[PDB]
Design a protein around this ligand. Structure first.
Ligand SMILES: [Cl-]
Ligand code: NI
Length: 167
């Protein structure tokens, strides 16, 4: 099923996710719904926080052909290096953008969809998306990296867009 994605200024987006205790049937269903939602929204990543489920679960697909599913359950950042930054969007901040400074390279450990442990070294867009999505799990949004005036403008624009969509 496609789930609702929360938009700013919803306070539930600021909630710090708890670790997943056991990757079970419930967790696998959440993962599958998150993929359905991410693809339906034409996004490249989604955190459980964004769908009002406050557990450390991320789904990602940065591929052009939309056929490279990555699941991070309980991800932990092991190392980071380099400097990068692109214009980022966010499904929770619809249609908005900002240049966000990030690490170019990250190494993480996590559990996959079957609950099997793995490690991953990532760079380029994948590394940027991992960091963006991991931020969500600690209640942090790309807005938080910006000036107060820019944050105000972004909030106002999302609020107007949401009124318009609310039909
Ligand atoms: Cl997002
Ligand atoms: Ni986001």
């Amino acid at each position: 099923s496609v789930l609702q994605v929360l938009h700013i200024p919803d306070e539930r987006l600021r909630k710090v996710a708890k670790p997943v205790e056991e990757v079970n049937a419930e967790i696998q269903r959440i993962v599958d719904d998150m993929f359905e939602t991410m693809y339906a929204e034409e996004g490249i990543g989604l955190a459980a926080t964004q769908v009002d489920i406050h557990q450390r679960i991320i789904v990602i697909d940065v591929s052009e052909n939309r056929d490279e599913r990555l699941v991070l359950i309980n991800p932990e950042l092991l190392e980071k290096s380099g400097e990068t930054g692109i214009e980022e969007g966010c499904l929770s901040i619809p249609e908005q953008r900002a240049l966000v400074p990030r690490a170019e390279k990250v190494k993480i450990r996590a559990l996959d969809r079957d609950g099997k442990p793995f490690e991953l070294e990532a760079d380029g867009l994948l590394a940027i998306c991992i960091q963006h999505e991991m931020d969500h799990l600690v209640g942090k949004l790309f807005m938080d990296y910006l000036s107060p005036l820019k944050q105000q403008r972004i909030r106002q624009k999302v609020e107007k867009l949401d009124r318009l969509k609310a039909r």
